[PDB]
Amino acid sequence: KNIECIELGRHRLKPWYFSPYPQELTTLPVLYLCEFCLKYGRSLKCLQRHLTKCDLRHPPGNEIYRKGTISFFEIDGRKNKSYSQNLCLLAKCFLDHKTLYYDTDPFLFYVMTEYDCKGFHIVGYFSKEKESTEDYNVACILTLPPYQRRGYGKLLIEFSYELSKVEGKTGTPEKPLSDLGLLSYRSYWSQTILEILQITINEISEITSIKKEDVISTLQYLNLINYYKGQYILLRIDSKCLHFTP
Numbered sequence: 001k002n003i004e005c006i007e008l009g010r011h012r013l014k015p016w017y018f019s020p021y022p023q024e025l026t027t028l029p030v031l032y033l034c035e036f037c038l039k040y041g042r043s044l045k046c047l048q049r050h051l052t053k054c055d056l057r058h059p060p061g062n063e064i065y066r067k068g069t070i071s072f073f074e075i076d077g078r079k080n081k082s083y084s085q086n087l088c089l090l091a092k093c094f095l096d097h098k099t100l101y102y103d104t105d106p107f108l109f110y111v112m113t114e115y116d117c118k119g120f121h122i123v124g125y126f127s128k129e130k131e132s133t134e135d136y137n138v139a140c141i142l143t144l145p146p147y148q149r150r151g152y153g154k155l156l157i158e159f160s161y162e163l164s165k166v167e168g169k170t171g172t173p174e175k176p177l178s179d180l181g182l183l184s185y186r187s188y189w190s191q192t193i194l195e196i197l198q199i200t201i202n203e204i205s206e207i208t209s210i211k212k213e214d215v216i217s218t219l220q221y222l223n224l225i226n227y228y229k230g231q232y233i234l235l236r237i238d239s240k241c242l243h244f245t246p
């Protein structure tokens, strides 16, 4: 673990893990990040100078969802390489591993923001492989620490499933899940399935885009397993505001 402190807009962030930022930036008291383009540098003065030329004020890509103060921006990792590359460097501060951190081409990124009079503030994101042989509808998911324990993680997961629905597919997060990932998914899966509550798990899976194995591990967790004749038997996203084209 190499970076002790990150400043991102109004927040001080405390990394959990090593992230391969330039080695000369890993021995500083504070690594300064532009909160809009996620550019990193060695001092507050260069940041203030930067903020003078930095146009953005939100993430790149297209604003495919907006409801109240919450937006989602869809960002092609190939079309917006330096932003996505900067996002991955930050994300790795809170991820145990991040495979292919340096190559953002294979991925889409869904960045969730909170809007106020100062701009669109990055709250968290999830990535997704453009092509997955394993039907992984999320590769990495993150809520930045200042926003954690507030329902944002479950909102990101819900949005990931809304995308799968439009694609007419079931999806599942990339494995292995971190323990924080599993706690979040378990909670989202549980609330979704109870909300549905006779129905078959095939029907649950078709309605929610959740893989059957995930519905089963969840009913197991909820002590709601009922195996009958070969068969298992039992902050929100408004999908009208979603404008997504697979």
Ligand SMILES: CC(=O)SCCNC(=O)CCNC(=O)[C@H](O)C(C)(C)COP(=O)(O)OP(=O)(O)OC[C@H]1O[C@@H](n2cnc3c(N)ncnc32)[C@H](O)[C@@H]1OP(=O)(O)O
Binding pocket: 094, 095, 138, 139, 140, 141, 142, 143, 144, 147, 148, 149, 150, 151, 152, 153, 154, 155, 173, 174, 175, 176, 177, 178, 179, 180, 181, 183, 184, 185, 187, 188
């Ligand atoms: C596929 C992958 O990427 S695996 C990688 C998973 N991501 C990471 O580990 C990155 C670091 N962690 C994070 O960014 C966050 O912890 C996330 C995204 C996993 C969860 O974000 P949050 O915004 O805190 O989630 P949210 O507030 O919606 O909580 C969801 C559920 O998880 C539980 N949870 C979240 N964090 C914790 C924690 N540290 N300890 C115990 N439970 C937790 C919540 O209590 C909630 O459960 P409940 O509905 O039963 O009350």
Ligand SMILES: [Zn+2]
Binding pocket: 034, 035, 036, 037, 038, 039, 050, 051, 054, 056
């Ligand atoms: Zn910037």
